[PDB]
Assembly symmetry: D2
Homo-oligomer: 493 residues x 4
Amino acid sequence: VPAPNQQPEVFCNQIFINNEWHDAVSRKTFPTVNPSTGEVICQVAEGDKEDVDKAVKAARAAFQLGSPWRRMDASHRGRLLNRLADLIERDRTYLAALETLDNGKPYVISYLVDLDMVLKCLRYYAGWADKYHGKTIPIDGDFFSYTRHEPVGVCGQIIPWNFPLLMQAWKLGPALATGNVVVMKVAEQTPLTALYVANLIKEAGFPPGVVNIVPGFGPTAGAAIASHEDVDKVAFTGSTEIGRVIQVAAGSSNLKRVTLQLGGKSPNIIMSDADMDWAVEQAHFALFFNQGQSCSAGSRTFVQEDIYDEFVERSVARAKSRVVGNPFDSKTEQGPQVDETQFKKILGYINTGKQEGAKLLCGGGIAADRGYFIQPTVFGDVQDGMTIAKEEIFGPVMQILKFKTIEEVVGRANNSTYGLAAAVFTKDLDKANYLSQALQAGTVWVNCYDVFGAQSPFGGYKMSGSGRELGEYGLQAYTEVKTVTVKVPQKNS
Amino acid sequence: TQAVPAPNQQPEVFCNQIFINNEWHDAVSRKTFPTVNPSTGEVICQVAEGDKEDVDKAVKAARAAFQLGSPWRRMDASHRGRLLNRLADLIERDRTYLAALETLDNGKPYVISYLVDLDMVLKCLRYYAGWADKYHGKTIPIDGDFFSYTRHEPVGVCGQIIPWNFPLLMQAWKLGPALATGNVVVMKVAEQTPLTALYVANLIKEAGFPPGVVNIVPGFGPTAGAAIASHEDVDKVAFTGSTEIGRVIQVAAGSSNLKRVTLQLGGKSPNIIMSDADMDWAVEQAHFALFFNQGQSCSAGSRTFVQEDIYDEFVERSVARAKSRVVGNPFDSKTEQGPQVDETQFKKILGYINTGKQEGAKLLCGGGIAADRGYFIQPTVFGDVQDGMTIAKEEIFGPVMQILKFKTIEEVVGRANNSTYGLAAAVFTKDLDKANYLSQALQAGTVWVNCYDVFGAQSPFGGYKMSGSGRELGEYGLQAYTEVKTVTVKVPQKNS
Amino acid sequence: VPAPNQQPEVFCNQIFINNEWHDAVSRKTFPTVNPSTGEVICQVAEGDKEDVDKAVKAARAAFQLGSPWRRMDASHRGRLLNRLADLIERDRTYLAALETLDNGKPYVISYLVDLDMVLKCLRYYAGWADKYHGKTIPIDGDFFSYTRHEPVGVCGQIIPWNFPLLMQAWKLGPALATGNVVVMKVAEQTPLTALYVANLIKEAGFPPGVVNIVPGFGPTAGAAIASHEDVDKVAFTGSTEIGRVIQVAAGSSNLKRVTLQLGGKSPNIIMSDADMDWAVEQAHFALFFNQGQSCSAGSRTFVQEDIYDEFVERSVARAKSRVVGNPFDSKTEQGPQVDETQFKKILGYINTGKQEGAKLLCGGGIAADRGYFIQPTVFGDVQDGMTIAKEEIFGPVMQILKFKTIEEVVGRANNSTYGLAAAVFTKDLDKANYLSQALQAGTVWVNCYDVFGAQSPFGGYKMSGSGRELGEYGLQAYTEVKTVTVKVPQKNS
Amino acid sequence: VPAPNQQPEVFCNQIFINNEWHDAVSRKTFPTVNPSTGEVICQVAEGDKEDVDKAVKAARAAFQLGSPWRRMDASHRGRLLNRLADLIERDRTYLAALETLDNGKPYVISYLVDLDMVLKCLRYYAGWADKYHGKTIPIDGDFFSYTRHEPVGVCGQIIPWNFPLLMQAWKLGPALATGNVVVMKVAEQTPLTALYVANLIKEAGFPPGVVNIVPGFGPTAGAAIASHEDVDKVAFTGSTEIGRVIQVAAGSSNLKRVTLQLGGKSPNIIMSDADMDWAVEQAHFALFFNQGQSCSAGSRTFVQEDIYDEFVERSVARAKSRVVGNPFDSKTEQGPQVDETQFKKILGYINTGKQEGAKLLCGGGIAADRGYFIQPTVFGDVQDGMTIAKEEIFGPVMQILKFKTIEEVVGRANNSTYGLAAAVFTKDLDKANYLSQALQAGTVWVNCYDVFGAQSPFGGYKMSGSGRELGEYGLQAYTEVKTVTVKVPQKNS
Ligand SMILES: Nc1ncnc2c1ncn2[C@@H]1O[C@H](COP(=O)(O)OP(=O)(O)O)[C@@H](O)[C@H]1O
Ligand code: NA
Ligand code: NA
């Protein structure tokens, strides 16, 4: 990795509409903070309802029949996405540093993981631009019938702060591949990197109005998008509680299409026949990755009783050795949490676990004086009824539960209103096949964890969300299917 | 051959209760409600009035039949196909009976119930039976030493709420894809037309579907229907009906367990007649487009746009056709139009007709009540209709035709698209470029060219805008009943 | 299993054209023999070139634009296929008995396997009739581009004798689903059941000429179809030897489309961690099923050296216990071979096994005084270079080979010009994944064998064939893709 | 359009194997000529069987399990195809001139059409590299069944001289996207541009052996490919004559998989209600494009009797004004024919046309003293039974036929053993729909001609070929489908 600029300059901090930069109508700004220091990085235009209104009008205009964007060859949408990826890669080092500054994650990870996954996401979806065929259909009678795969239209996209660049990419990729237009609301904690990418969107040559980004707060800017009478579809990633607000707001306004990707309490199951070294390291990664701030974190580590003690001992050892510090320091494995709000929410869950009888094995406290750093925390002898075993913590807090039989762990892992991910570690062919089929989760990993690819869909069962992102499936929510049924003189096979 | 067997005009009712675990239950409250014959306005029988407690019992049954290792989960996908095919066979066995009961309860002409509704039900179930073992998931060439793939699982417990305009067909549109994909059902049928759907439940048991796979709770909307939309253990609701209630369905889902929602709502579909259309065909098709099923179709061509050069001719012919349209007893062979489904719709349509006269639309024929018994309305045609008129914007859902004049093709595109509805549209023209341009330009879920109301199980149906979300029929109608699971496995060495 | 009629009466023994029965033009007939007794069942019309020509004309006229078959709704093709299935299920015991009479396979197997698979194949493909969509395609420019999935046309279908009814179903299913017409040439060894199905095809209501069946010999009737100038497509199942003749004939005639399913020498691989009891019975079934007359037979049983001796001893014991006898007797597991030619060929390979030093562990001789019964035969210590280890025997003769490492057995299994099927028995996930990927075989079975379904495609790698049958894939060779590209006033997404 | 180098240098004229240049084993060379002058451009290594043998070994080795190419991420195969197109675009101006130098087509066309389509083809297929999913299949019983989409392996690719670079890209795109390796035989008339791309294939970073190119003659190098025992699949494009030879060699050797794209005699149908101006210009393009050297050329122009005289009148005027000259002169619409052999053959056909009673309306002779230039030639009053209305001329010779009715024109247009393309020009929706359905041709254009897109498949009905290239369909022939069926403890939906 190239040595980072530990204080990268900010070039974009305004509202992005029609390929131009605007202050908020109200002229208001809000500060974004460095989670490693607690210091203000800069101010950013505080978009609200009136700003969203302007973004939607611009998106609506670019989606007009006969416009440059509507008329553009599908294959050229691909060229543009590929160009956007090239421009992102050109500026990879700057963006990786900016991502760490605003979010707190280690710079090595921003560079090698986040930025790499963004490039791969955009390059993958570039390929889909001219391949998502409709159908010609053998209907009865003297008719020829077919479907057009058309864009859904103006798409509001509301994204979180845990993976700012990658969440932006996950949203823009499929939306732009299918010819939609976007009004994006980035997280108030991490607006900067997505604003810079907006400039690259312009540089890549996307028509004005095709992508519009409105930085600002949720109940203001986000709520305005979700309630807007001229937004055709909304895609939301965030908390389960705001997912309700979004869905309610859609039904209360114009019945716009909705998809959601929410939180989880994903079970990581370690059978007695698992490779212990690999299972311990993967279980550590499964929980602690990205400061524990992953919707798919394996926050319920089920370990079979015969290997429980050894697993726990090893897990505690690895958690005590996890390096917490300056995310720009290459030795650092764990940066700070994203903000003070999350910081406190995690301290409350830690205290909760102690009160309700969970066994604190290591960590459990504040790791430093400045910023929002928390010690890697491991709870043992966790029971299903416990709050730390039911609710998403979104911090470096690991729960280890013991089980006995394979049919028991099935019932206990499935006993949840969440269903985002799950994992099984075993060497047995039959146990893996039985578990992968039995687990009620959108993604099941066998002998691995947090393996994402732009090709394989991702999304939740139950209250972890609805619909899928990534892969071919990710195009479905961005398609309005039109049936054209034509009277013909004589139908033949 | 399209000949119809003489109907029993007073078909016996065998089923009038809540169907749960392949058995008939009274409402927990023991309360019942009357279903009425709209031809006379008189009660046919009492039906058990399912409420939230009855829905709870239905959902627990569905959940149990959906347990891993259950007969329905373990059943071969191909066998699900055979059960759907068996159910179709049974419905065909009782076709003459089912058609008559559909007419008794709903009001539509018997010849249509037999030749159209029952036919379409058969074709829909037989279509989706074939999908049972063909809706493949994928193996996916993901990066690295991994083998990744998707399982296409069922969503789970599916709440299904349907209207009264096509009681049997709406039931089939729901059960076909849901059962094909291995789901279980709690269905809430319209209070106006519960009977035929309940008799089909009897055939479901006879065909050998495991107990709890399909549960039907007859009853009212805000009671039974809302209990389903808000239930904490229903995974998915699919609703057909008014846009207004669709909102309620979506809010209830977000307010409860964030269940998956698909909707098929109302419309105000533009039927567009270019000056180069075949006049005779366009006239008869537009008449059918509006007046089909007593005007009680969500996709009715309730804005007939006619190019100015053929406006006068088209209107004269449409009025003549509407005047000759026979209204009467649906079991009578002469009848093209039966009564509206109930008194509420009856007065509601009459209300819209009055507004049409009020706003200056020319009443060209009909406009009133057609008989002093039942809910019959005269076939009504309004001419010189303008975009801002109430009858031009709101769904009437009755035999009331709006005819509007236009000049250019650019004009008619903007006017037809100027609607919060977008369920269907049509274009009548002989020109290749005009048909292609209009079919692409119209913001509607289904666009018909030189025809109208051409539905097929193979072709997807659903709305743009506020006419719904998602699609039914075809391969697409399986997407909402599928839960996709990605399985990603570490392998020793990935090779192409 | 309902009781059989061990002397079914024959209703059809002529040439089937335009739904009517015809004698051969030459009026010649040929005997078909009951392989259990060696007695002549009846005479069958001997179709040749002139008869094939009349069939091709019948088919060609049924395929003309505006004909009942071309105009028929796709869904109705599904109705007709389901009706034929119902008619076959009605006459199930009759056809299962006639299959056993003419072929030799046990009645219990004819009834429970062959006929059940026939019904499931036809009902599966009935579902496909109206679901094999073409595409609408986002081409560059102001154009609308789509594809029509039309039928390929007059299909010549040449089938073998090992699974007379099933092989017929495998051909008719996909061809009729997609609206093609058929000239079918059935094996001279087993013509009766297929000719009876023709009667049911008529009864079901298929239009005249949609299916035409010409019994007769290969070099006469078969070659006539293969070289025919008005046959658009040929599909052949049989020996690799004759596969070449088909492919040469097609190229020398009208360049008709060709798909082939040919022989095999399929490896069945038993790892030391396999379930012994299961692997032994399954290896036995893998080789011995259908009197060893299966293209996918596990004719190379590779066994890991740690379990070799135990596996061999158990296999020998199971082979010695395999009941040979009257196929109508409920206890018979193995009937006679199909005819004298096959009978002599199998004895020849057995002699070859002894001559080359393979260890004859049991069987090896003639098992009855009349008919074509051969003792269940097992060779041990088989080497890759032996003839019985290289060539397809198509009889109750088993080859057991010893191996040491997983990479050794991969190279050894793949060292063949055959590649139709393979199997792996193991409890280990990683081994199972590595082997299924490494093996160059059309179907790889894991902890099972000979598991077919109409849903999953089947066909060979290398010289075991080209193309696939069954599943959605089986529709590909029976479709002719037409692109329609239309100029439009203005292309919009 | 960038000013061309009228005499571009040749850097590559040898055999390409393992990313290295070789002389032929025989050390022999052959001349390639500039068809505009008749002068030799340079000598090219004359590959034969012995050289084909080295290429196959290199390809086979490159395709071995565990090789860099077999292990490479599917998405990365996409990066390589994109990189290859990037390099081709860098060298676009040079390649366009060299294409013109060796082929004779106008430089303006090479640059704007040929090179543009090459870039679009390669980039389209780069998108397919990680998206051509196999299936998970709901088979009966306690089993999990799925398909892997594997490469077919060593693919022999034999191409002609009419679109040298585009034919190469049509073959390489789908082959490399799906993980295959290639032994390509370019036409002796136009080897140079494909040889240069090979240089760029090395530079792009494709592993050695993945693409090997062998220049040389047909009956030597090409036959060696079709007859080779370690070539799994062959794709051929060229004459119907040689297509037969390829198929026979395939069936005679190792039963390699075969797909063909052969000649045509495509009907272009002008209804009386067609836009006269558009139809006249399109019909001119349909025939005369690329010096008449297109397999899909509209060489049967059917004009309705009511507009015949005017259409002919306007077509003669256009033909008479079509600029023949130096392909590097921007005003040139038609360069020379590819070589003296085609030159004489076309002149021969012209002689036949006059002899058989066709009415010569203009052209009919040589257009220059130097090179192989032919006057744009129009025959009127052409009848279906004339040699020039039946046989593929492959030159600037136009056939105009008169018809009365729709039914008549369907019969006459379909009365051909060719079926590659067709077109209908009409303003009427029903006529267009009836005709596009009734026409037995691989591609049907409506109110256009020769509209190709990498997204829409291309291939012939009848003896114009088998299988399809371009689009999703173009991946089918480059995929070997493997079914993996696994026994599971308990199958659930
Ligand atoms: N007998 C043959 N076997 C294999 N390939 C051949 C044979 N003859 C020609 N070819 C090759 O096939 C390609 C197409 O050639 P061909 O069909 O002869 O068209 P043309 O005759 O117009 O050159 C060329 O690359 C040529 O070298
Ligand atoms: Na920040
Ligand atoms: Na026989």
